[PDB]
Ligand binder design. Sequence first.
Ligand SMILES: *[C@@H]1O[C@H](CO)[C@@H](O[C@@H]2O[C@H](CO)[C@@H](O[C@@H]3O[C@H](CO[C@H]4O[C@H](CO)[C@@H](O)[C@H](O)[C@@H]4O[C@@H]4O[C@H](CO)[C@@H](O[C@@H]5O[C@H](CO)[C@H](O)[C@H](O)[C@H]5O)[C@H](O)[C@H]4NC(C)=O)[C@@H](O)[C@H](O[C@H]4O[C@H](CO)[C@@H](O)[C@H](O)[C@@H]4O)[C@@H]3O)[C@H](O)[C@H]2NC(C)=O)[C@H](O)[C@H]1NC(C)=O
Ligand SMILES: *[C@@H]1O[C@H](CO)[C@@H](O[C@@H]2O[C@H](CO)[C@@H](O[C@@H]3O[C@H](CO[C@H]4O[C@H](CO)[C@@H](O)[C@H](O)[C@@H]4O[C@@H]4O[C@H](CO)[C@@H](O[C@@H]5O[C@H](CO)[C@H](O)[C@H](O)[C@H]5O)[C@H](O)[C@H]4NC(C)=O)[C@@H](O)[C@H](O[C@H]4O[C@H](CO)[C@@H](O)[C@H](O)[C@@H]4O)[C@@H]3O)[C@H](O)[C@H]2NC(C)=O)[C@H](O)[C@H]1NC(C)=O
Ligand SMILES: *[C@@H]1O[C@H](CO[C@@H]2O[C@@H](C)[C@@H](O)[C@@H](O)[C@@H]2O)[C@@H](O[C@@H]2O[C@H](CO)[C@@H](O[C@@H]3O[C@H](CO[C@H]4O[C@H](CO)[C@@H](O)[C@H](O)[C@@H]4O)[C@@H](O)[C@H](O[C@H]4O[C@H](CO)[C@@H](O)[C@H](O)[C@@H]4O)[C@@H]3O)[C@H](O)[C@H]2NC(C)=O)[C@H](O)[C@H]1NC(C)=O
Ligand SMILES: *[C@@H]1O[C@H](CO)[C@@H](O)[C@H](O)[C@H]1NC(C)=O
Lengths: 193, 207
Amino acid sequence: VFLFPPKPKDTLMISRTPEVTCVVSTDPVKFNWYVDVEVHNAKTKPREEQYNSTYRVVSVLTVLHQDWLNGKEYKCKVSSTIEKTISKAKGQPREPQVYTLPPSREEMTKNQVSLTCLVKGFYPSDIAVEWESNGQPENNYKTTPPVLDSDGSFFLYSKLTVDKSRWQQGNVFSCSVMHEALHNHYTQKSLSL
Amino acid sequence: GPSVFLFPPKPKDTLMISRTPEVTCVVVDVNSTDPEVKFNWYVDGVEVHNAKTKPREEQYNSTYRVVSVLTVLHQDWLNGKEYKCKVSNKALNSTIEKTISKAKGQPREPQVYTLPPSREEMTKNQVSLTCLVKGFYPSDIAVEWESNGQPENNYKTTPPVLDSDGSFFLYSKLTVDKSRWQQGNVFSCSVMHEALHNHYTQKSLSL
Ligand SMILES: *[C@@H]1O[C@H](CO)[C@@H](O[C@@H]2O[C@H](CO)[C@@H](O[C@@H]3O[C@H](CO[C@H]4O[C@H](CO)[C@@H](O)[C@H](O)[C@@H]4O[C@@H]4O[C@H](CO)[C@@H](O[C@@H]5O[C@H](CO)[C@H](O)[C@H](O)[C@H]5O)[C@H](O)[C@H]4NC(C)=O)[C@@H](O)[C@H](O[C@H]4O[C@H](CO)[C@@H](O)[C@H](O)[C@@H]4O)[C@@H]3O)[C@H](O)[C@H]2NC(C)=O)[C@H](O)[C@H]1NC(C)=O
Ligand SMILES: *[C@@H]1O[C@H](CO)[C@@H](O[C@@H]2O[C@H](CO)[C@@H](O[C@@H]3O[C@H](CO[C@H]4O[C@H](CO)[C@@H](O)[C@H](O)[C@@H]4O[C@@H]4O[C@H](CO)[C@@H](O[C@@H]5O[C@H](CO)[C@H](O)[C@H](O)[C@H]5O)[C@H](O)[C@H]4NC(C)=O)[C@@H](O)[C@H](O[C@H]4O[C@H](CO)[C@@H](O)[C@H](O)[C@@H]4O)[C@@H]3O)[C@H](O)[C@H]2NC(C)=O)[C@H](O)[C@H]1NC(C)=O
Ligand SMILES: *[C@@H]1O[C@H](CO[C@@H]2O[C@@H](C)[C@@H](O)[C@@H](O)[C@@H]2O)[C@@H](O[C@@H]2O[C@H](CO)[C@@H](O[C@@H]3O[C@H](CO[C@H]4O[C@H](CO)[C@@H](O)[C@H](O)[C@@H]4O)[C@@H](O)[C@H](O[C@H]4O[C@H](CO)[C@@H](O)[C@H](O)[C@@H]4O)[C@@H]3O)[C@H](O)[C@H]2NC(C)=O)[C@H](O)[C@H]1NC(C)=O
Ligand SMILES: *[C@@H]1O[C@H](CO)[C@@H](O)[C@H](O)[C@H]1NC(C)=O
């Protein structure tokens, strides 16, 4: 039995649907879901198997945004019985600082440049970062996991890669960050030559 | 029954002829009745006999733990030789074995770029000096920070991250007082990786 938390972007906008996932040979399992009180609205995927001939029943509970965000605990009961609990990390959320950073002058000799988004000082570590230009999203980026900082908050970097030609010619790129301590759960910093 | 775990040398260890890379094999959950165990060590499938095995040590959960350390030739490791630890118990005839080696694939040289703090970050007492290391393979790597010779130990570094082209990148953030930066001090980022010349390069940074 293993209990996973919902995706960051899904809890931070009322339009998404956040979601707790409980993931688990000859005689398979009843799921019970209490929320710090039994709940009945979880859906359950049928048993799919693997190379090792074990079943893998996944169950999915749909959680309320403020429930998950206000710290409510989520209990998965997979039957005797075995348990597992999760909730949001405890503690005063902290607002992230978002800085864009142009490519190194030593990188300008490559045919592709790195645009950097440093996100600093947020808590808890749940966060989504994205990249845009001209309103359309940018595919070619990669974001590092949150890394605990000497001060108990978190940072990460996100690296967007573009042809040098798009950067040289003045195109504007934006780093979009979603975190609960941000006003409207969202901020963006733009970058350009 | 019992479990075996096998741990690689540290990146820094294999990259400097002066250090001592070691592979460590650990047996846990050895039943405390008749707890006589054996280690056998294989490099590329051929047995070797230079490992150094500690006495078994009783743990606080009614089980015994035994640890066996094999010293490794630097170039053996970076050449991808395979290290097998076989662990046998004399009472039950069965055995457990694990295999470790450097990640397979063609090594790729890291690029290192220093990025100064952002202008908006200058309104704070703490500024972040960034070191982007990218395009390297495998992901074993050591990064460090210096200023004016001495070590600068207020930094964090990210796990290697797999990039679109099969290489890895990481960032390393050194945090310093805005005054030290503005007074013009050079700070240096140090990178050790097997695909660097002398397994070592160093980029500097300043106002
Ligand atoms: C037979 O073989 C099968 C298949 O190999 C075995 O199943 C495996 O069992 C392992 C346990 O023995 C288990 O290992 C644990 O893994 C977790 C981490 O799991 C995540 O990451 C794995 C990669 O490391 C993935 O394989 C997992 O599937 C899982 O991925 C995440 O899964 C989430 C659940 O859905 C999903 O989140 C949801 O996403 C949706 C949208 O998709 C919604 O938004 C929803 O709201 C979300 O909740 C994520 O997207 C998904 N992400 C990724 C990147 O995959 C690991 O933490 C755990 O560690 C425990 O123990 C260690 C001890 O050191 C400790 O460090 C931890 O703290 C923790 O206590 C285990 O290592 C395998 O993951 C699992 N394989 C699966 C499930 O595919 C069977 O076990 C075998 N037979 C038997 C008898 O066991
Ligand atoms: C009874 O009590 C015993 C005693 O504790 C229990 O033993 C534990 O069992 C655990 C599982 O059964 C096992 O967990 C695995 O852990 C590894 C990582 O462990 C390392 O890091 C831990 C801290 O998080 C330590 O507790 C561990 O001791 C271990 O430390 C590493 O030790 C290495 C060898 O000494 C060392 O390498 C050397 O280091 C020197 C310098 O010290 C040199 O550099 C040299 O060159 C190196 O060779 C490492 O540095 C050191 N690491 C650190 C961070 O300090 C984990 O990876 C592993 O994960 C498995 O499972 C997951 C999924 O679950 C999977 O994804 C993995 O791929 C892998 O399959 C295990 O989780 C513990 O290690 C172990 N504890 C000890 C102390 O041995 C029993 O379990 C108990 N039994 C009962 C029944 O209760
Ligand atoms: C650590 O290892 C210990 C030693 O392990 C043994 O030796 C190794 C080399 C392996 O072969 C291993 O497989 C061996 O077990 C281990 O200790 C052993 O533990 C098991 C159970 O854990 C014990 O087995 C049980 O023995 C009892 C006692 O039997 C005596 O009493 C009856 C009278 O009541 C006599 O008539 C007998 O002839 C014996 O002299 C049994 O009663 C019991 O049977 C029960 O279960 C069966 C079904 O399985 C039912 O039909 C019965 O009605 C009973 O309800 C078990 O067979 C074993 O005796 C014990 N031996 C020693 C020397 O320690 C220890 O468990 C290991 N520890 C860990 C944490 O793994
Ligand atoms: C233990 O099993 C192996 C493989 O079956 C066998 O070669 C070995 O001889 C056995 N041990 C003894 C003492 O015979």
